[PDB]
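Q: What would this complex look like in 3D?
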Amino acid sequence: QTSVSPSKVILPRGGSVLVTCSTSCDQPMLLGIETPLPKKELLLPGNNRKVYELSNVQEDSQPMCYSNCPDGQSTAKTFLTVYWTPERVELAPLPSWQPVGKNLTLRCQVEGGAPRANLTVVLLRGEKELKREPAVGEPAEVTTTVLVRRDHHGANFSCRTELDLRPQGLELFENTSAPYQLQTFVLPATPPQLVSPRVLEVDTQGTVVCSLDGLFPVSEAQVHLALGDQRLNPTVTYGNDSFSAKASVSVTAEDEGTQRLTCAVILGNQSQETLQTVTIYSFPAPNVILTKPEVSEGTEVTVKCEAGPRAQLLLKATPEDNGRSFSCSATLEVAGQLIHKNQTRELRVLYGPRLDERDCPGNWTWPENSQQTPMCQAWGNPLPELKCLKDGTFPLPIGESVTVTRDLEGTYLCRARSTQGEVTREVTVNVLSP
Amino acid sequence: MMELAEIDTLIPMNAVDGKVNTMEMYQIPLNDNLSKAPIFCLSLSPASDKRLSHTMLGEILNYYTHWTGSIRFTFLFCGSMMATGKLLLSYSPPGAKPPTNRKDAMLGTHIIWDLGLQSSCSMVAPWISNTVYRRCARDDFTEGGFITCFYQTRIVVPASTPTSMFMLGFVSACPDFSVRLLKDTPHISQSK
Amino acid sequence: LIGRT
Amino acid sequence: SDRVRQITLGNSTITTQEAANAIVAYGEWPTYINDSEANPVDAPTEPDVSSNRFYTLESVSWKTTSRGWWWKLPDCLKDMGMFGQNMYYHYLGRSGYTIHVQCNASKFHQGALGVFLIPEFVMACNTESKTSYVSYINANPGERGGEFTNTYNPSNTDASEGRKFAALDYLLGSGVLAGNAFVYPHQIINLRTNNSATIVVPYVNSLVIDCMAKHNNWGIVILPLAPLAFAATSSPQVPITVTIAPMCTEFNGLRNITVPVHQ
Amino acid sequence: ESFFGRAACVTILSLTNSSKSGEEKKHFNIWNITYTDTVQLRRKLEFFTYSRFDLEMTFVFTENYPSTASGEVRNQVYQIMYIPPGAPRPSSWDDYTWQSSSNPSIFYMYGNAPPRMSIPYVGIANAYSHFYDGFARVPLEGENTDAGDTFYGLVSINDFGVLAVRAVNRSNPHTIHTSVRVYMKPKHIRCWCPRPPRAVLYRGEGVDMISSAI
Amino acid sequence: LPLTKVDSITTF
Ligand SMILES: *[C@@H]1O[C@H](CO)[C@@H](O)[C@H](O)[C@H]1NC(C)=O
Ligand SMILES: *[C@@H]1O[C@H](CO)[C@@H](O)[C@H](O)[C@H]1NC(C)=O
Ligand SMILES: *[C@@H]1O[C@H](CO)[C@@H](O)[C@H](O)[C@H]1NC(C)=O
Ligand SMILES: *[C@@H]1O[C@H](CO)[C@@H](O)[C@H](O)[C@H]1NC(C)=O
Ligand SMILES: *[C@@H]1O[C@H](CO)[C@@H](O)[C@H](O)[C@H]1NC(C)=O
Ligand SMILES: *[C@H]1O[C@H](CO)[C@@H](O)[C@H](O)[C@H]1NC(C)=O
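A: Here is my prediction, written as structure tokens for the whole assembly.
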């Protein structure tokens, strides 16, 4: 009697299906098929064997073959199943930055996909399977917790669906979402090392160096270096989970005073910061003010500094002061540090050139070939230049021990001159026979 | 034999799953609720149907080949006395869309039955045919037609009254009715 | 005509 | 004159001045069912003047190329006014018809149309595998009808162009020589003689009344027995108009309306 | 009358009484009640659209030996059984259906005169039609635009049941084959509406043609 | 069991 072949078909969405209708009776008046679609009927033996091509099957349908025999209107049914992969497979949006040691949840969403009885959703860490579950609901969600380890680094996580139609005679159709990359970190709670001069002069250049280690991913960290309201441009150098940021800084007159140097290391929503002070300076030299730099013995002398009562040093100049030095010392506080600076200045006191018979005898009588030491010393401030010449060019060897010779004999004119005057004295050397 | 075909015999109308082949098939469901759906439907194929076959009319017909005549469908309401209602019984002859709603069935041969002291009401299917005889076997040529029932109003019960009940549907032939040409019945089987 | 055999 | 004729039914009147008599098919005029011959026991619906009147079909064009035309009764009137309604509301329907074919030319034209009315006009299907395999659309085209061809092109594998009539001219699509089609009620529109054909046809069947949604009792066929020719152009063209009136229409078995499968 | 007054051969049925494995379905044969098997009587009926007659059946049996199984069999008794529509149709050649309490049947003893009988105008209409320009049941709205197809024409509608024919003897050691011929004469005949004779070759039940002979 | 299973009571 009424028979159908195939009785179960699986085909892709939109395809044609071939359904053979058949019956068994003597006069089958009408063999026909159920369904409401466009249907090419071929022929084999008459109303006993027919073939229908039914075109464009979009959804599951079950066309039964009915056969009108007058004795028995019997009917037989075929089941058509169609197939389709998910229209979307993706992981719910998750922050890229993820805390080490804390739990994270992955959530895959699969929209569509049928037959659902053969669709599985799976969560993966790289190529490893973490979770597998039949697809249920719409969208079909599948979730799993993942304990963030350092092991989880550039680990890409993904979701995959498996529409396994192999048991129906087809194949396994897979789909995959965009991967998710875990960007973790860890930024210890300790200030970065900051090396910098506690002091810096106006209009000069300085060098700051900031560094820190034990952080990850160092390449992603933001390093903020700045002195006062001046943001610095550092040259970051990376290493074994570490960094060193070097930067130059120039200061001007406006920056004079105590300024704040800061280094901040930032990762995610956490930051470690170091605060230090740098003093920018200008220390005008404490100049020594002498009433009169050059003065004569006896004059009143006043000394004051210039760069609460005003103090000056008064003293009556004595010859012993010629060449002596007065000083003006000062101190300045910059960045809790004490800077010292001074200035000394000499005072010239005066006494005209002098040649007493006492310290420059008018005559000498030495035996030829004896040892003597010619004595003639000028006195005065400034120290007078002395020259004892004979015949305008032959000098008397004063102050030194010599062997008396014939050519020492003669008359010398000892001249002692200086800005205070000039004094002349005649010296006679007699050289007796040995 | 035709004398026996004029005797009112009970139709297995409600021979649905769990109701087939038990006394429950003769009992047509009725209730207080207002639907617009058919109470029953029936193809006028009177020997070769699922329901009408093992009636006395259907049986006698299936020892014969050809038939002619008007069919009497007599219905007995078996509710409580206190249950009122108006129904519509119809015979639509064939060749158009089958009467799924009441406005379709109302456009054919119909009767509005008022439930009352007269417990039984007949609806006659008049002999309307192209061919002078029809087949007892099921035909696409000598088509029979469609019998239905609808609610006109609803069945209405008052306080403390059974909200659901049944009717009994009988079939008999009319005195215009005749059969011809003998054959053995397809109903009975025997071990070889 | 065919027959049947 | 035999040539001059008027015909009036309902609110509709045909006139012709160059007919060649009129013919009554088999000698018998349309008649109703008689109480002695009646079969359905319901009181019949007789529409009279509402339905029994001239309905004019869309005119076809005779060319030198034209091979023939066919229509079916009551199919070609199923959409026609109040007749179509009475036909499709009832299960059973009976009717004879007055068939009036019109084709005027000039005294300088040649051509001869054989207008035949064939009872039960079952043509062969256009496929050598399946037998008598014709869809509801392809069997019942309505007002349009179908045309004849002089070629037999069977779609042996398929259910498109194999699911329709092989309307072969010389064999009437039926496998019988068209030269013997004169055993049916007929007239010839020979353009040098007449411009009209008038055939009155009774109800013919093996039954009293039948289901008009099943059965076409009559088929109208028009074949060019002599081809259309005009002296000047090698492509002449003349309109052929078919006007049909039913008569003695009666219907049994009222229900909801029959809407068959469609396009 | 006179034109139709001949017993013309319609179908030739094989049945084969054998004792071999797959020959139980050979021991009987079933035939459709039509008149399209042969062309000679058909073409003469096909002169008219409608006819009406009583029918004379005459049956001629001829048995023979198929292979070199030319050995001993006993005289064959055949049964021709008419099975009208909606009836118990057989399972094997021997069974309960073929008892025939109401199904009219003929018992032929081979060697006797050709068995014959008369049948009335049994038709469901007022005359027979050799045609039908219409459908069986109506194809309605939402079914298929292309519907009606298979259920057009006389072939779709004109069921009259079947003949079942058997040998009533059991299977013998040697296989015997029997051909039965069905002859028909329509008598008491009158016909309506002449039509042209069939000009070209027939194809089966319908009116249909072929490509290679028109 | 003589009788055939009906699909609905609203089967035509
Ligand atoms: C995911 O991570 C694994 C392990 O490092 C790697 O081998 C794999 O290719 C990655 N997948 C993608 C899409 O990058
Ligand atoms: C994340 O949390 C759940 C609940 O504490 C725990 O059971 C699970 O082991 C954790 N995942 C991993 C990989 O450690
Ligand atoms: C899923 O994979 C199929 C093939 O298996 C492909 O055609 C389709 O485009 C994919 N769908 C998505 C959403 O990627
Ligand atoms: C990371 O530290 C380990 C231990 O010293 C060493 O093997 C590796 O080269 C280091 N990478 C660096 C220096 O960035
Ligand atoms: C002044 O500073 C100098 C360094 O340049 C130092 O040598 C000297 O001792 C200071 N003089 C004083 C005591 O004011
Ligand atoms: C940090 O804070 C932001 C702002 O709410 C948040 O969106 C982000 O996920 C947090 N990340 C962590 C845990 O450092």
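A: To summarize the key features: The interface with chain A takes residues 129-130, 157-159 of chain D (CB under 8 Å). Chain D has one domain: 5-254.
Q: Very helpful, thank you.
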